[PDB]
Write a protein that binds this DNA or RNA. Structure first.
Lengths: 360, 115, 107
RNA sequence: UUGGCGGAAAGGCCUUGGGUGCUUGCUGGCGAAUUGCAAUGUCAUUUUGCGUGGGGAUAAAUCAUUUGUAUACGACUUAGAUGUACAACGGGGUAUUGUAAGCAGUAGAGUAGCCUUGUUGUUACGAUCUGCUGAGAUUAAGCCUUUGUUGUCUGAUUUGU
RNA sequence: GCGUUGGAUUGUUCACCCACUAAUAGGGAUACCCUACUGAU
RNA sequence: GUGAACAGCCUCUAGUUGAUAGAAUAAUGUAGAUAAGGGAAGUCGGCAAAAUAGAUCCGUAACUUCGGGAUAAGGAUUGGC
RNA sequence: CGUGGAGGUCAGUGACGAAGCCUAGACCGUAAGGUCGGGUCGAACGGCCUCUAGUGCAGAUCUUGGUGGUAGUAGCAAAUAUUCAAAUGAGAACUUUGAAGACUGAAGUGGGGAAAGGUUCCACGUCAACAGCAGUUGGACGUGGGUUAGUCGAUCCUAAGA
RNA sequence: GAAAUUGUUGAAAGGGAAGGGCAUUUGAUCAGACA
């Protein structure tokens, strides 16, 4: 028989941060300009999608087929600083950080943990070190230009630009896949206190990796933890413990849309011709509205709603046809998931119901 | 005496994870602390400087109480009481060398060279 | 700061998924806690008329909403916690909808 | 004091300038006693403290509270000091069911009925039906939204190279 | 490295069929108490 | 009142409101329930759970010690004005 | 070597502190064991030659008594269910009253009896114990009060029977 | 008013063992004789 479990994710404990931390990146290619290797946003809900299908040879070629997607809030993302990393015979070593002369209340509120009692003195000496000349800064920058075979940039989100209310910014580091590390840090230095799209990293007809932390479910025992049957000790004998809130990594994820907040009628295919953003009736379920850019990707990401995720651009040069097919949407369901949704727009609600006692 | 205890955070001041909020012990105890503050005031002592220097507690004789349980047995059931005492005190913000001649002449020579 | 108020309080969103024999008593504590939040005092007193109003539909039949009068007051001597407390008595309506909080004028 | 170099775990290695000494490179003068024949005969270096007189900067965290992306208890994540604030209600949006109390009717099998003896006599009762009625009630407790009203917005503790 | 089935028949392992699938190979190894294991500060 | 009833359910007369309490919903337990589609394949073993069950109309075989088996089986019906 | 007692002996020690006890304070003896100093303590006791015995302990699923871990753990979880204000008092999840909510639902959580129990019945006062929580309450504790017969019954009859 | 056992203070030590033996170090503590 098989074993009622895997063995790879074996120390089934909770992770240490809700930010699932990037561990891998595709290595480099020092011929291109710089391309950001990752991005991050906040998962919001699911929808259903039909899609006409250019899949040569498949049974469903040139047919409509319904599939199911998710959605994530993807505001613009501002850069605040960089770090270098050098190869050793130990591994890698953080040797310098540098920050960007003016920092948001959000990230100042991240590094502090009890905000309002704080004097909010986070970088007041660093901005003073940003002198008339920036001498020490350029000292500790050109160092990295010399050293630091590979380099990362810090980001933070603009979370006030979401329906969510947490007030706090989720830092991260992001690796680059350009060359000319001097050019990398020069590019980033120009990008200091400057923000970046998600259609400026990704596009359609793309595959991604989705790394996040799962929904928690508490201390569920064997019968629902491992799907094991019901009536010294070894470490693979299917004993009860914590489920959920593990980190995971989900790959081979076909994007269909790279949305846009300013673009009205985000739910518009070529077919619908209806001025509706994808935010369906009722708001999202435990998430609010989508008045920003977004992504529509098939399958189902690890997470729960109003949870953060991190994105990576598939980490290698894929080989399957499905990694290269050309997407064409036909219709977005835009109904409320707060019930068995029937109607896309409240004007359609008015139209099919008619006028009512409260209407006049 | 810290077993099968639910843990809670309010001991993190003390650097300890396990803690609990007894009432009865505390009622008797602050009875005593009020008695001792009263007695120090009776002596005519200050309380603003005053700290507990010594507390003490030690077992005491048991009630022989009972209950009745399975297989027809008087299995005992009984107390664990306490003597208590404490002493409170006003805070207060407050040899010759045998040696040898070989060691003596050396230091005398260091003086001799000390100009 | 002697003050009186009206207040609504929504029990359907405070007594969801509860043991039937504790739906009604728990509402008492929820009401006192509501006074503790809004008025900002811990020692609370109630009305047996209001207790009737809560209990009248049994224990597992408590109404989804009520409407209340609250009167923070001074206190008598050496009730050592504070010179103030809170008192709670109901006010009668065919519905507690279309209402909202108000300071009632003084007479 | 000058300019260099070095990131692998650099924390050091050079070099300019002078200042400052000592020179056993050569030759002189003075002193060494007494630890009594030796007794490690104490010379370095780690850390810390109290005092010294001189510069330098004047914060977090935890608890309590609240949320809940988490939840055995702990923990992890959030919010809160005069505002893009936070909350309790209320409105609006979604959905949930399935058409309320209050009445009115020339619907209402029928049976009596005061007699204006009908020729729908009308008056009594009368399951229900028809209309005010997709009406009514509910809606976050682990939904959306808010220019509304009304309140909160300085409580305890601990920490130092 | 990964996999080796659903049934029919006896208290009984002895005995031996039907059909699928790629195959349906053979073997061994009260319990709160301290330990180990699963999880948590 | 109910209904065949002294079953069970509700109530008046009368009497208790006693059974250590509080805050929380993690599993698993203990008692109690529901589950599509198939319908005892599972299992030594229809163990337990579940199925009809009340009242009326028709009807109820073989076998027999003719007395029964027999609430046989099996079909229909059950409200209110 | 040591112990309980006995015959002698040291004109023995002894309130100016015998005996016992404690003591990482000393000395002896290879060792059993002895000796000493300090502290505590308060009235008898020891050295030697001899005697006599109920004479020496790690143990006996030993005996009696006491005390520990386990542990502030298991557990106080059947009996639908309790809630608000006032009084009392220092103190109320629990006593009393009052307003609501429930129940036994008359083959009862009602009112009376037999056997048995024997002051539990009633008041006042009261909590150190008991009421497996607490208690200002109670069948608990202290002090008292109270059981009225020509007709109910026993006694009388005889039953199987002794 | 002993012992198990228990607490407070003082000293010391401590990574899945403790206790004991031979010698010594560190720290505490201590008797004797010099005439």
């Amino acid at each position: 028989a098989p074993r009622h479990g895997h063995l790879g994710f074996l120390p089934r404990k909770r992770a240490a941060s809700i930010r699932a931390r990037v561990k891998a990146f595709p290595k480099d290619d020092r011929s291109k300009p710089v391309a950001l290797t990752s991005f991050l946003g906040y998962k919001a809900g699911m929808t259903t999608i039909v899609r006409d299908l250019d899949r040569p040879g498949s049974k469903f070629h040139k047919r409509e087929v319904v599939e199911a997607v998710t959605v994530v809030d993807t505001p613009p993302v501002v850069v605040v600083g960089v770090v270098g990393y050098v190869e050793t015979p130990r591994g890698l070593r953080s040797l310098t950080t540098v920050w960007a002369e003016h920092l948001s209340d959000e990230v100042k509120r991240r590094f502090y943990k009890n905000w309002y009692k704080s004097k909010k003195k986070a970088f007041t000496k660093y901005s003073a070190k940003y002198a008339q000349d920036g001498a020490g800064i350029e000292r500790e920058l050109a160092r990295i230009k010399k050293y630091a075979s590979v380099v990362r940039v810090l980001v933070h989100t603009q979370i006030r630009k979401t329906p969510l209310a947490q007030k706090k910014a989720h830092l991260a580091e992001i690796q680059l896949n350009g060359g000319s590390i001097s050019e990398k840090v020069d590019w980033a230095r120009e990008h200091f206190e400057k923000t970046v799209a998600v259609d400026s990293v990704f596009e359609q007809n793309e595959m991604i990796d989705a790394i996040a932390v799962t929904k928690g479910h508490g201390f569920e025992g064997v019968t629902h933890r491992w799907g094991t049957k019901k009536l010294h000790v070894m470490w693979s004998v299917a004993r009860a413990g914590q489920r959920g809130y593990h980190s995971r990594t989900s790959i081979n994820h076909k994007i269909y849309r790279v949305g846009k907040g300013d673009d009205e009628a985000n739910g518009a295919t070529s077919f619908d011709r209806t001025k509706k953003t994808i935010t369906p009736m009722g708001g999202f379920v435990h998430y609010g509205e989508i008045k920003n850019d977004f992504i529509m990707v098939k399958g189902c990401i690890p997470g729960n709603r109003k949870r953060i995720v991190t994105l990576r651009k598939s980490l290698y040069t894929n080989t399957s046809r499905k990694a290269l097919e050309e997407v064409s949407l036909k219709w977005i369901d835009t109904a409320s998931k707060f019930g068995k949704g029937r109607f896309q727009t409240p004007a359609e609600k008015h139209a099919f119901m008619g006028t009512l006692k409260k209407d006049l | 005496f810290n077993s099968s205890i639910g843990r809670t955070a309010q001991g993190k001041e003390f650097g300890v994870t396990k803690a609990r909020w007894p009432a009865k012990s505390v009622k008797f105890v602050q009875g005593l602390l009020q008695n001792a503050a009263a007695n120090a005031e009776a002596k005519g002592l200050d309380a603003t400087k005053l700290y507990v220097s010594h507390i003490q507690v030690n077992q005491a004789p048991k009630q022989r109480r009972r209950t009745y349980r399975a297989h027809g047995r008087i299995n005992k059931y009984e107390s664990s009481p306490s003597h208590i005492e404490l002493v409170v005190t006003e805070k207060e913000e407050a040899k010759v060398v045998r040696l040898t001649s070989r060691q003596r002449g050396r230091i005398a020579a260091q003086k001799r060279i000390a100009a | 700061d002697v003050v009186t108020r009206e207040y609504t309080i929504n029990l359907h969103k405070r007594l969801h998924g509860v043991s039937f024999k504790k739906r009604a008593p728990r509402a008492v504590k929820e009401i006192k806690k509501f006074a503790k939040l809004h008025m900002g005092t811990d020692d609370v007193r109630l009305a047996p008329e209001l207790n009737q109003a809560i209990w009248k539909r049994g224990v597992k039949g408590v109404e989804y909403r009520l409407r209340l009068r609250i009167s923070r007051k001074r206190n008598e001597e050496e009730d050592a916690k504070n010179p103030l407390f809170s008192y709670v008595e109901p006010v009668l309506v065919a519905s507690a909808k279309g209402l909202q909080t108000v300071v009632v004028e003084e007479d």
